[PDB]
Amino acid sequence: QDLYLRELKDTKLAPSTLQDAEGNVKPWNPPQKPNLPELELQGPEALKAYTEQNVETAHVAKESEEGESEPIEEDWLVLDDAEETKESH
Amino acid sequence: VSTLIPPKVVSSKNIGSAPNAKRIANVVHFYKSLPQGPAPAIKANTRLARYKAKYFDGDNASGKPLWHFALGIIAFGYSMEYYFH
């Protein structure tokens, strides 16, 4: 069907200079290559956070420590305050 | 943030509490007490201790020696009657 044929040939070929050969675009007055693959290519890193979330920050955890190796001057206080609790107990 | 420790602080606790005084009082009160009325020495004789044992213990305790002592004064001055009048 040459209706279908000529329709599909113009359908294929009229944007084929926008897809097959990159002679960017004749009817569109703004250029097409600085829309999606140049501006909007960094789109998702213009739409999400840059240099922390997309670079993802493989980050070292803060090494949380013990009671800093001091028994004496606080274990005696814990012992005497425990005497005071057992007074109150 | 750490293990708290009042299960085992009874070391220097057992002086301060109030029945500790009663406990250390009656462990001293109970050792030297004779068991069951022992060492009673229920008989003694000094020519008049039998008079006390028959008359002046907790068991007899009746006023009769007074009566005896009353008769003693009846025994005393009446003879002095025979010395005087």
Side-chain angles (χ1 to χ4, degrees), chain A, chain B residues 1-22 24-35 37-41 44 47-85:
Chain A
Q1 181 178 1
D2 293 331
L3 182 143
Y4 162 75
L5 263 70
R6 296 281 77 79
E7 285 159 352
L8 257 293
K9 288 302 290 182
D10 292 330
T11 304
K12 178 72 173 179
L13 192 64
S16 291
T17 186
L18 279 72
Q19 185 175 3
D20 188 73
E22 296 292 328
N24 211 175
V25 62
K26 188 183 265 79
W28 298 350
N29 287 320
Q32 186 181 5
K33 288 180 182 180
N35 206 166
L36 298 172
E38 178 175 357
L39 176 62
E40 285 289 331
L41 192 276
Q42 290 84 17
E45 64 181 0
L47 194 145
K48 299 295 180 181
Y50 65 99
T51 197
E52 290 95 8
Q53 188 179 0
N54 294 314
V55 182
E56 294 168 343
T57 56
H59 189 268
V60 54
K62 180 69 176 176
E63 186 68 34
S64 300
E65 293 181 353
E66 191 64 29
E68 286 91 11
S69 69
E70 190 270 321
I72 298 169
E73 299 175 355
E74 290 180 352
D75 280 329
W76 289 105
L77 288 175
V78 167
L79 188 63
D80 291 333
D81 292 333
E83 280 292 333
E84 289 183 353
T85 61
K86 198 172 178 65
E87 288 180 353
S88 67
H89 292 302
Chain B
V1 292
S2 176
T3 51
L4 191 65
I5 185 172
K8 60 185 83 174
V9 199
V10 201
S11 66
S12 63
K13 184 260 176 184
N14 292 324
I15 299 171
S17 70
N20 291 321
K22 288 178 69 67
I24 68 169
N26 58 9
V27 297
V28 176
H29 179 73
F30 276 152
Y31 66 89
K32 199 180 283 186
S33 67
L34 53 89
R47 282 83 177 273
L48 279 82
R50 297 177 291 114
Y51 185 84
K52 179 169 74 176
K54 187 173 73 176
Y55 285 161
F56 288 147
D57 297 335
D59 195 3
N60 292 313
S62 296
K64 303 190 298 296
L66 293 171
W67 174 258
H68 286 283
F69 185 75
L71 188 61
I73 305 170
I74 299 168
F76 179 70
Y78 186 71
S79 67
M80 190 175 287
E81 177 70 25
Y82 283 167
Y83 189 75
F84 281 163
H85 183 73

